[PDB]
Design a protein around this ligand. Structure first.
Ligand code: NAI
Ligand code: FMN
Ligand code: SF4
Ligand code: SF4
Ligand code: SF4
Ligand code: FES
Ligand code: FES
Ligand code: K
Lengths: 263, 430, 44, 213
C-alpha cells in the first residue's frame, strides 16, 4: 500500500495519496465546517470556511481542496484556525439578511448551526446590507437570493449531476448574483435536489414553504414507490400529517438525491 | 558595489523605451534584438535555465519569485500534453504602465523572449494575454509577430533551429483580476476570470490542463538580453538576491511623471529627484509614497529619505516592491480620499469568488468612505485593522492581500490624521 | 542620421476597429497545427 | 448596471444579430488559435468581435456566440456580465472612459470629468441625446505616468487639461478623429523636460555578448 502518514491534531492516520485535508480530518471522526464543499460535487474552494492550520506553516490552507503532504500535523482546533472560522463566518453574516424567523431553512440551517458552533456571537458590521432581486426558476424552487452565500452548489449540481448548464454567476464582486440571467425556468427531473444542497434558505421548497419547521417533524425512514429505483426517503410528518419528503443516503441507489416526482 | 543607481545607457535592456526608434523588425535587429537567437536556442533548455538562475532574475510581475527556479518547474518529461508559456501582459495595477511601454515600443524583444523562454521550458506556443484596454499595443505587437513569422524567426523552424514555436495574442476584456496568473488562465480558457486554488500550480495544471508558466512581460523580455549579455552581467547590478535592472513608473505628485529603466537597488529619493524632477513643491512637500503600485503599503517621508528600491529593503520597510510603480503624494493630498479611492478600485476589481474579498473588500470600502468624512469613532480604526487581517491570508488569490495592505499602511502611518478627521466631524456635527 | 527627436511609433494613428482581428486572420496561415485533446469538447 | 436580463422589444432573442461573412472568417481564425477540443476558449474574442460589429451586445449576440462555439448560453452570459467592456446596453458612438483612480485623481482627473460633464451637458453614465457620446468613469487604464487621461473606443488621450479634452470633444463633434497621444509636449512616456536617460545611441547587434554563444 502507498498510504502516507499524516497527523490530525497529533493523531496518526494513514491516507491514500491525493487525500484532501478535510478527508484526513474526517477519517479520525472530525468534521470541518464547510459551505461550498459537497462530497458529491466538484471542489470549488470559494467559501474559505474550511481553512485549517497546518503546523510549521504560516498560512491556513483550504482543507476542502488541499491534498495532504507526508507528515502534516493538521490543527483543527488551534487559535488561527478558530480565528479563520470566525472571520469567514463574519463575512458570511455581514450582508446576510435577518430573515431567520421568515426563513424555511431555520432550524435546519448550516449557516445558523455553524454560526453557533464556529463563529463569533455578535456583529461588528455597522453598515447597510445588500438586497438581491429574487429570481423565478420554477414553481418548485422558491428563490430568495438575498440569503445566498454564493457557494456555487447550484451551478456545480446543475452542471455535473443534472447536466443542465443553465445556472451561473452574473456580475463581479459583491454584486455577483447566482441565477440564470434571463427569465428561464430550471425544470429538470432532479431540479428539487438544489433545495437539499443549498446550505441556506436562498433556494427553498415552494410546496413546503411556510408550512412546517424541522424541529417538530417526525422523521420516518421509508422507500419511494414512484419509480422502480426504490429510492430511500425520509417522510417527515407533523401532528399526523405528511409535511415533506427528503432523501436518505443509500450509496447504491439514490446516492443522496431523489427525483422531483418523489420530492 | 555598495551604493546603487546611476545606470549607464550602454547597460540598458530596454533601449527604445521612449518610442524614439523604430519598433519594427529592421529597427529591432539594429539594436541588438534577434541576434544569435539560434545559438541561444540550440544550447538546450538546461543552459538557458542556468543563465536565468545565474542572473538572479526575480519575477517582475510583482511578487518576485526566482525566475529560473520558476521556469525550471517545466524541465520535466512530456506526459503527452503540450506545454505553454503564457505572457502576462494585463498590467492592471494603478501606477504601473511599464508593460504597455514594452509592448508598444520593444515588441520584438517580447517575441524573442517568448521564443527563448519557451525553448527553456520546452513550450509549444506563447499566449500573450494582453490587456483588452491596450488595443493599439495589441495590434502593434501583432505587426511585430507578423514580421517575426515572415522573417522565419518564429513558427515552423524558428530561427533555423528546428524548434517549432507559435506566438498568440489573446486580448483581455476589462478585468484587473485577469492579471492574476490562474485567473488569466481561466480567462484564456473562455470563462470568468476567477483565480484557481493552488495547488495545482500552473506548471502541473495550467492553461487548458497543460503544463504552463505564466510570466510577466518584463521578466520575459529581459531574458534574451540575459542570454546574450550573460547571467553574470545581469547579476552585477543591484544588491544580492536583488539583481538586475528594473522599469520604474514615477507618477502622481512629481514634476515629470515618467517611465525609466534604472538599476535595481537605487534609492527612492535619488530616483524621484533624478528622473522625475522631484516632488512638486520640493522634497519637504512630500507626504507619502506608494512605492510599488496600489497593492503595496505606503511609506511616509521619514522612510523615503533612506530606502532602496528593491524587494528586500522595501520588505524591511514593512511594505513591498511590487511593480516598482512609485506613486508620489504631496502635502496637499487628502490621503484618506486617495486610499479610500484605492479600496474602491479593489472592490470594483474583485471577481466575487471567495467570501473574505467579496464581502470584506466592500465592507472596507464602506468603512473607508465613512473615514473620509470622519463619520465614525476611533474604535472603528482598530476594528478595520482586524477586518484587513481577516481578509489577508484567507483568500484564494492575493487581491485580498492587495486590498488589505493599503488599509494597513494608512492606519499604521496615519492613525492620528484619521482620529483628528473623526473628532472634527464630531465637533462640527454635534 | 541619428534621430532622437521624433516619435517613430506613428502607425497606431491609423488602426481601425478590425486591425487586430485582420492581423490574426493574416497570421492564421503561418501557424503550426493545433494539438488535440482527443474529443470535440469536455461535454462530448 | 443590472445583471439580470429583461426582454425589451429592442433586446430579446428575436433581435436581429448575425455576423458578416468576413467576421465569420475572423471567427475561424480566432478558433484556430486554440487546441482542438477547447473551442470554448474562443468566447472572449468572438463576443468582443460582436461588440465591434454591433457596438453593444443584445441577447442575440450572446446566443450566437453560444451557438457557433457549441457552448451553453449561460457560459456566454457569465463572460458578458463579468468583463466590463461588453456593453449590454447601447452606448454612444464615442465611449468616453475617464480614469479616476489614485494616480489620475492625484493629477486632477476631477477637473476633466467636470469639463466633459459641463461640455456635453450630461453626467456619468448618461448618453448625449444624439447618441454620440457616452460618459462613464472607469478604473486604471494603465497610463499612469501620462495622467490625467481618457479612453475613446480604442484610443488613449493623455496628459490632458480641460481645454484639451474640450478641443477633442469639439473635433469629435465635427467628424474628424484626433491623435491618440499626450496633449502636453512629450511623445509617449519620457520625462517632460527632456530625456534623463536613453540619450546615447543604441549599440546594436554584438554588444556585450558573452563568449561561447
Ligand atoms: N503587475 C501588475 O499589474 C500587478 C502585480 N501584482 C503583484 O502580484 C503579487 C502577487 O502575485 P502572486 O502570484 O499571487 O504571488 P506569489 O505567492 O504567488 O507567487 C509568485 C509566482 O511564483 C510562483 N510560485 C510560488 N510558489 C510556488 C510553488 N511552490 N510552486 C510553483 N510555483 C510557485 C507562482 O506560480 C507565481 O507565478 C503582488 O505582490 C503584487 O506586487 C498585483 C497586482 C497587479
Ligand atoms: C490580483 C492580481 C493581479 C495581478 N496582475 C498581474 C498583471 O497584471 N501582470 C503581471 O505580470 N502579474 C500580475 N500579477 C502577478 C501574477 O500572479 C504572477 O506572479 C505574474 O504575473 C507572473 O509571475 P512573474 O512575476 O515571475 O512574471 C497579479 C497578481 C494578482 C494577485
Ligand atoms: S439562510 Fe439561515 S441564517 Fe439566513 S435567514 Fe435563513 S435560517 Fe437565517
Ligand atoms: S443559492 Fe444556495 S446553493 Fe446556490 S450558490 Fe447560493 S448559497 Fe449556494
Ligand atoms: S479574493 Fe477576491 S480576487 Fe481572489 S478569488 Fe476571491 S473574489 Fe477573487
Ligand atoms: S469548504 Fe473549502 S472553501 Fe468552501
Ligand atoms: S491610474 Fe489612471 S491610468 Fe492608471
Ligand atoms: K435550502
Amino acid at each position: 500500500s502507498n498510504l502516507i502518514e499524516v497527523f490530525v491534531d497529533g493523531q496518526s492516520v494513514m491516507v491514500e495519496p491525493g487525500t484532501t485535508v478535510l478527508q484526513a480530518c474526517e477519517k479520525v471522526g472530525m468534521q470541518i465546517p464547510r459551505f461550498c464543499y459537497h462530497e458529491r460535487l466538484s471542489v470549488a474552494g470559494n467559501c474559505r470556511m474550511c481553512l485549517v492550520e497546518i503546523e510549521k506553516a504560516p498560512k491556513v490552507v483550504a482543507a476542502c481542496a488541499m491534498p495532504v503532504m507526508k507528515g502534516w500535523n493538521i490543527l483543527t482546533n488551534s487559535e488561527k484556525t478558530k480565528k479563520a472560522r470566525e472571520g469567514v463566518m463574519e463575512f458570511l453574516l455581514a450582508n446576510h439578511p435577518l430573515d431567520c424567523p421568515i426563513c424555511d431553512q431555520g432550524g435546519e440551517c448550516d449557516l445558523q448551526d455553524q454560526s453557533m458552533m464556529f463563529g463569533s456571537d455578535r456583529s461588528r458590521f455597522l453598515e447597510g446590507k445588500r438586497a438581491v432581486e429574487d429570481k423565478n426558476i420554477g414553481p418548485l424552487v422558491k428563490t430568495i437570493m438575498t440569503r445566498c452565500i454564493q457557494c456555487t452548489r447550484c451551478i456545480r449540481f446543475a452542471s455535473e449531476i443534472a447536466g443542465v448548464d443553465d445556472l451561473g454567476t452574473t456580475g463581479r464582486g459583491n454584486d455577483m448574483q447566482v441565477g440564470t440571467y434571463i427569465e428561464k425556468m430550471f425544470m429538470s427531473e432532479l431540479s428539487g435536489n438544489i433545495i437539499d444542497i443549498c446550505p441556506v434558505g436562498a433556494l427553498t421548497s415552494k410546496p413546503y414553504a411556510f408550512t412546517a419547521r424541522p424541529w417538530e417533524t417526525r422523521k420516518t425512514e421509508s422507500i419511494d414507490v414512484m419509480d422502480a429505483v426504490g429510492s430511500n426517503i425520509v417522510v417527515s410528518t407533523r401532528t399526523g400529517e405528511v409535511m415533506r419528503i427528503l432523501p436518505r443516503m443509500h450509496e447504491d441507489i439514490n446516492e443522496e438525491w431523489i427525483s422531483d416526482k418523489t420530492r | 558595489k555598495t551604493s546603487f543607481g546611476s545606470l549607464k545607457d550602454e547597460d540598458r535592456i530596454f533601449t527604445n523605451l521612449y518610442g524614439r526608434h523604430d519598433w519594427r523588425l529592421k529597427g529591432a535587429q539594429s539594436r541588438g534584438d534577434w541576434y544569435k537567437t539560434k545559438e541561444i536556442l540550440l544550447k538546450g533548455p538546461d543552459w538557458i535555465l542556468g543563465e536565468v538562475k545565474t542572473s538572479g532574475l526575480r519575477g517582475r510581475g510583482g511578487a518576485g519569485f526566482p525566475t529560473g527556479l520558476k521556469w525550471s518547474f517545466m524541465n520535466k518529461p512530456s506526459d503527452g500534453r503540450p506545454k505553454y508559456l503564457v505572457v502576462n501582459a494585463d498590467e492592471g495595477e494603478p501606477g504601473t504602465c511599464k508593460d504597455r511601454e514594452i509592448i508598444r515600443h520593444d515588441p520584438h524583444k517580447l517575441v524573442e523572449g517568448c521564443l527563448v523562454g519557451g525553448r527553456a521550458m520546452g513550450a509549444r506556443a506563447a499566449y500573450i494575454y494582453i490587456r483588452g484596454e491596450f488595443y493599439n499595443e495589441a495590434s502593434n505587437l501583432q505587426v511585430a509577430i507578423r514580421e517575426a513569422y515572415e522573417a522565419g524567426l518564429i513558427g515552423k523552424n524558428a530561427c533555423g533551429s528546428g524548434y517549432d514555436f507559435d506566438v498568440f495574442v489573446v486580448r483581455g476584456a476589462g478585468a484587473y483580476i485577469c492579471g492574476e496568473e490562474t485567473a488569466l488562465i481561466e480567462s484564456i480558457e473562455g470563462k470568468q476570470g476567477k483565480p484557481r486554488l493552488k495547488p495545482p500550480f500552473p506548471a502541473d495544471v495550467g492553461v487548458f490542463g497543460c503544463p504552463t508558466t505564466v510570466a510577466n512581460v518584463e521578466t520575459v523580455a529581459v531574458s534574451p538580453t540575459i542570454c546574450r549579455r550573460g547571467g553574470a552581467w545581469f547579476a552585477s547590478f543591484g544588491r544580492e538576491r536583488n539583481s538586475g535592472t528594473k522599469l520604474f513608473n514615477i507618477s502622481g505628485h512629481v514634476n515629470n511623471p515618467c517611465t525609466v529603466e534604472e538599476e535595481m537597488s537605487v534609492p527612492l529619493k535619488e530616483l524621484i529627484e533624478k528622473h522625475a524632477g522631484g516632488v512638486t513643491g520640493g522634497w519637504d512637500n512630500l507626504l507619502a509614497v506608494i512605492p510599488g503600485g496600489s497593492s503595496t503599503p505606503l511609506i511616509p517621508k521619514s522612510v523615503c529619505e533612506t530606502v532602496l528600491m528593491d524587494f528586500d529593503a522595501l520588505i524591511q520597510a514593512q511594505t513591498g516592491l511590487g511593480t516598482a510603480a512609485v506613486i508620489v503624494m504631496d502635502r496637499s493630498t487628502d490621503i484618506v480620499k486617495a486610499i479610500a479611492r484605492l479600496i474602491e478600485f479593489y472592490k470594483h476589481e474583485s471577481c466575487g469568488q471567495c467570501t473574505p474579498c467579496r464581502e470584506g473588500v466592500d465592507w472596507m470600502n464602506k468603512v473607508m468612505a465613512r473615514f473620509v468624512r470622519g463619520d465614525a469613532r476611533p474604535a472603528e480604526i482598530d476594528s478595520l485593522w482586524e477586518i484587513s487581517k481577516q481578509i489577508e491570508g484567507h483568500t484564494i488569490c492575493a487581491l485580498g492581500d492587495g486590498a488589505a495592505w493599503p488599509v494597513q499602511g494608512l492606519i499604521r502611518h496615519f492613525r492620528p490624521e484619521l482620529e483628528e478627521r473623526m473628532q472634527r466631524f464630531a465637533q462640527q456635527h454635534q | 542620421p541619428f534621430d532622437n527627436t521624433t516619435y517613430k511609433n506613428l502607425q497606431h494613428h491609423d488602426y481601425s476597429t478590425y486591425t487586430f482581428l485582420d492581423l490574426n486572420l493574416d497570421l492564421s496561415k503561418f501557424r503550426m497545427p493545433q494539438p488535440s485533446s482527443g474529443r470535440e469538447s469536455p461535454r462530448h | 448596471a443590472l445583471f439580470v436580463h429583461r426582454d425589451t422589444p429592442k433586446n430579446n432573442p428575436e433581435t436581429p444579430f448575425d455576423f458578416t461573412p468576413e467576421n465569420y472568417k475572423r471567427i475561424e481564425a480566432i478558433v484556430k488559435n486554440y487546441p482542438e477540443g477547447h473551442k470554448a476558449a474562443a468566447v472572449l474574442p468572438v463576443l468582443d468581435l460582436a461588440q465591434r460589429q454591433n457596438g453593444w451586445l443584445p441577447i442575440s449576440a450572446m446566443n450566437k456566440v453560444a451557438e457557433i462555439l457549441q457552448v451553453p448560453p449561460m457560459r456566454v452570459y457569465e463572460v458578458a456580465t463579468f468583463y466590463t467592456m461588453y456593453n449590454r446596453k447601447p452606448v454612444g458612438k464615442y465611449h468616453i472612459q475617464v480614469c479616476t483612480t489614485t494616480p489620475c485623481m492625484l493629477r486632477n482627473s476631477d477637473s476633466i470629468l467636470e469639463a466633459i460633464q459641463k461640455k456635453l451637458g450630461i453626467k456619468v453614465g448618461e448618453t448625449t441625446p444624439d447618441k454620440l457620446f457616452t460618459l462613464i468613469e472607469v478604473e486604471c487604464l494603465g497610463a499612469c505616468v501620462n495622467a490625467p487621461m481618457v479612453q475613446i473606443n480604442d484610443n488613449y488621450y493623455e496628459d490632458l487639461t480641460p481645454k484639451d479634452i474640450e478641443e477633442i470633444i469639439d473635433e469629435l463633434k465635427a467628424g474628424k478623429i484626433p491623435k491618440p497621444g499626450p496633449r502636453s509636449g512629450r511623445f509617449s512616456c519620457e520625462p517632460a523636460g527632456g530625456l534623463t536617460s536613453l540619450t546615447e545611441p543604441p549599440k546594436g547587434p554584438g554588444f556585450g555578448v558573452q563568449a561561447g554563444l
